[PDB]
Ligand binder design. Sequence first.
Ligand code: BEF
Ligand SMILES: [Mg+2]
Lengths: 32, 287, 996
Amino acid sequence: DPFYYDYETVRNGGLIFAALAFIVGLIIILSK
Amino acid sequence: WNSEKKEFLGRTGGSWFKILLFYVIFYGCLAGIFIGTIQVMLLTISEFKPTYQDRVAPPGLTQIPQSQKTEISFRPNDPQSYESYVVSIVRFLEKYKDLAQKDDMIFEDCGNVPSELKERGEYNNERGERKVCRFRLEWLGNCSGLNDETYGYKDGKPCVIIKLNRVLGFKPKPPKNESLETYPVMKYNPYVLPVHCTGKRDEDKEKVGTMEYFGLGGYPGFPLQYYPYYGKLLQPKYLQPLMAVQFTNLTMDTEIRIECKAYGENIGYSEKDRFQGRFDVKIEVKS
Amino acid sequence: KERDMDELKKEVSMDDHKLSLDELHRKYGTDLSRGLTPARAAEILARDGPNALTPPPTTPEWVKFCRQLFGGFSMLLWIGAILCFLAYGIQAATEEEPQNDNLYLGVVLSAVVIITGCFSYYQEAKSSKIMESFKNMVPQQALVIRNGEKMSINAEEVVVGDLVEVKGGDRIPADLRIISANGCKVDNSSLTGESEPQTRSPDFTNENPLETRNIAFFSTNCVEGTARGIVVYTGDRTVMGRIATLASGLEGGQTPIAAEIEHFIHIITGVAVFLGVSFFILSLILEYTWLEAVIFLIGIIVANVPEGLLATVTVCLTLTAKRMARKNCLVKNLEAVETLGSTSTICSDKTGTLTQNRMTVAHMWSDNQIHEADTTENQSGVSFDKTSATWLALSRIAGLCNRAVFQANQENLPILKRAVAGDASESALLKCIELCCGSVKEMRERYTKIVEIPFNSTNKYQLSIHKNPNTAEPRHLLVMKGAPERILDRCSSILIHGKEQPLDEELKDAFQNAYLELGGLGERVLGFCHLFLPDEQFPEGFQFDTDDVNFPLDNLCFVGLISMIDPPRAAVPDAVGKCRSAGIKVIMVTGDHPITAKAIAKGVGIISEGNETVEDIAARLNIPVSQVNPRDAKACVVHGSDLKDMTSEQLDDILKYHTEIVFARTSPQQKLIIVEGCQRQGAIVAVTGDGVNDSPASKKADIGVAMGIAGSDVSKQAADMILLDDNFASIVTGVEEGRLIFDNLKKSIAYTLTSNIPEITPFLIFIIANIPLPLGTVTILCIDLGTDMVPAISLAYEQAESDIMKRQPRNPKTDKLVNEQLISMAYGQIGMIQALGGFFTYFVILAENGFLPIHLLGLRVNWDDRWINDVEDSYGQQWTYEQRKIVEFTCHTPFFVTIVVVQWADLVICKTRRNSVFQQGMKNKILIFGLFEETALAAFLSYCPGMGVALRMYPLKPTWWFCAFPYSLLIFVYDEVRKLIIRRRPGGWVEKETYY
Ligand code: BEF
Ligand SMILES: [Mg+2]
């Protein structure tokens, strides 16, 4: 059915993104 | 006091025409873009298909007198006490008269008994404007079932039509003959979609109501020969089924509550949305 | 009638110091050797007040916190929460969900008002609470004489007109009329800025009773000697008591930034009420009864608010206030932090401020040649050639001949900045010897002092004699110093490279011309001489005596002069070199004398070499000083004597027609009006000082600097800035920063103001095209105050796009912070495209789901209705309520992903005001971090579970993300082709309509 959307997938994926870019920012502000 | 300046309007009127002509050239470009963008995004909307519909998954059971808060409160005496609710039913069914439905080029006379689904090809435009199944005021006995016996509309005893939301394409599946507790309903589970109402939900209930259901050829639900829906553009002046429930033995000067659920695999219920899969009305026939 | 009181305090004080002592004793009724009776003393001590300043009138309450909570901006937010708690009391007529929505919005708006107003009231509070904080005192108990009997009583039981004796070490208990004295020198450095110690005498000497000698002053310690003096003024009637009180009852004035803040909050509320009205009008025009026609007026006046431009402002500053905390420039209040980069004229005191107030070896005379010592605090300069015999002679002379000796714990401290008990000169000398020529510990104990002769009354000399340790000549050694004219009278032999000579009149006038050439230079000069003794006439064991001359007072052997002066702080001069290169005017204000000031001003660069004064041009042409025209003198020395006889326009003419200005012998009161004459030009003024003489002048300067250690306790208590290390080069770093925070701020505002165009136009066209709600308020709350938080913080660590110190200081009336072209950009242009991409985000969603753009006109009506569960789209689908409302909130949330998207393009084109962004680059790390967090946050908020439930934001289908792309793109393109045509066409149109 076109009446069912893999909501749980892009979520678990938008939070990976929210995990990746933030620690790259934890990487950038700590230049040693 | 800077509004007026020696031969110059407000803020440097002298270069007035510059600033403005820039704000006329810029915004009209800002507009000639955005509209390019929107006109693009309208070229991608499929002409006959909505791209996303998942958010209408469990359709819902509505009423004709879309009251203020699902409460029909009126005096069987006062003509105006009920004019609201009734004019609503009058207008609601204004589009439904057999003579409004005359020309046969876009209309088609279907079985007078609940039939199988009327697949008319595919949802595309290859075919021409598809025909709409008709609907005659009869199938609703008493409550708006012809001129005879219903001048008032509920004036005496209350009654109300329940309706299924239109959902494009929905092939409603009724529960199988192995009915997972579907209360009193007759063995016409093959070609219909039933409903049944209750005073309260799942505990002790102020049970006060004798119900009588009017349907096509006399069943309690939704015929299968009208679905699925194919859309306005494909199907204009299409008429979806209506179904009526009437409350006869009702306490007048008391208010009770009524829940009307609809059953099947293709239907769901939501705790946060009481109008998804079921239906609710309070009533009070005060006099 | 206390304004008449505050006007008798800006006036230079007056007195009655010049009487016969019999007349003193007749007007006050007291004995000059017996004082008065403790009956008459317990009579006057309760007649006016204990000899005590009133405590600071300011001991303020805390309910003035309300003002921050209010203003003009926080009101709109108070009518915001009020009228969402109202809408919700209205939402009680049924069973409603705002158990997690509109109740929570009034408290959210209640909290910005309250958390915002806790932050600013703590910012301006530091000015009230911590800018009047300078305390650490030892109460000194006075030596009073009463009914004959010397009795020491506490400082406060003292009264007016009784006898007091002081000695060396005692603080002056109040303001006295010296009736008797003996060798008494006192230190009035703190009250008048007088450098070296001034002697004191009963005799009436000057008239300006300040520089007179028959009067002492409160808070001045008596340096040496002992004296007797009658009490004239007690408590707050003192001179210094008039000065703290004039320091405390003046206005700080407003810092160059908060004025914009208020005039900013004005424009936001006036376009908010402008909109709230003409649309309040149109919503009662259409249909909405008085009930949701007012709820919208909340929906908008409240949505127009940059809810978190206030935290982006507050950190935009903290980070400037931090970078300045890195450059040894501390601010009590965060908004004096920009004051310096905008200053045009700096006022500075000489003593304790520019200088260390410590007499030092400047120049020396040996082998008819002049050698400049090293005159810095940290020994970064030029040491003379120290190999010839003249110096080794001249050196042991000064080093043996002194009463000066080091103190116990002076070993690790710099040899200069360490404490010395002894005269100023005997300090300066002792110092430059222990410095240039090794240690004087084993050098003053090597020689045995037989008899010495301290400073005399007649002539000028100090001498001593010692044995010969040398193995060549066992002859006795004799040494002495004295003034250059009275020693030249008693001297003849000369010394060169180890061999003697006599006085020829040729070199006697090259000496009379290197004494008036080193002494017109402001330095103080002393002649050093020695003589062997005829060891045949005086044997190796004869202990001479002091009744008679025991050795030749003539035919002596002169060695060399040695010059000294109160020298400047090491970092001073370069620091001044900087302030001028930046075009700052620099003016010198000192209570010191016009010759030591003139020397000190010529040597620090306030007065460039070769500028001539009204007096230097008049003595060079041997003409009366009245002849010269005052236009040809670029500089000018203005005695404070003409400075009491002057008006506003004359001064106005001095400051206008003279570049290098120096004021001398100007009372503390006179330093204030100086700051007030430099402020009748409209320029900015930064006042930097040492003692209490700069209290009123640091008080009414736009920003006052104190000295951290050499600073007294009342001109520190007014200064709006502190130089703890007393490093004066710290001011050089401060002009650079107040001029950088200025420019990086202009970027921080323009970031959040552009947002306020794709925040409002939703709530706008909504009532217009009567479409469903495109942008919720929960959403405007996370743009102003949620995600942009950290982007608009990172934008103020931005750097200098060019050479900051190259351009001149800004012009307050012209160069504005928020000007009408910054506006023309953020609201006029950039935010418009921001609206156009978010709106385009809006139409793509509702159209792809079923509602064509052309069909949503006149829809919001049936749309915002909770009981129309059958609403037909352009595909004929019947939508319940929570279903179609679900599609709004997921048209609220993507409009918010689209904004962060454009707030990328806008965070990168605001990062540079003039330069292309491939020229300034992305070297900023925090800003990188700011894009990654402002995006990870936003992606966390949509897809986080139960986000639709608490906040009513749902997760995004992916195809949505990329609807702000060419919009964030085109935006980057526009402002970049703008920041290149203004790089190629400076001359008008392109640069003039836009540049903010
Ligand atoms: F302290 Be300054 F020399 F007036
Ligand atoms: Mg001073």
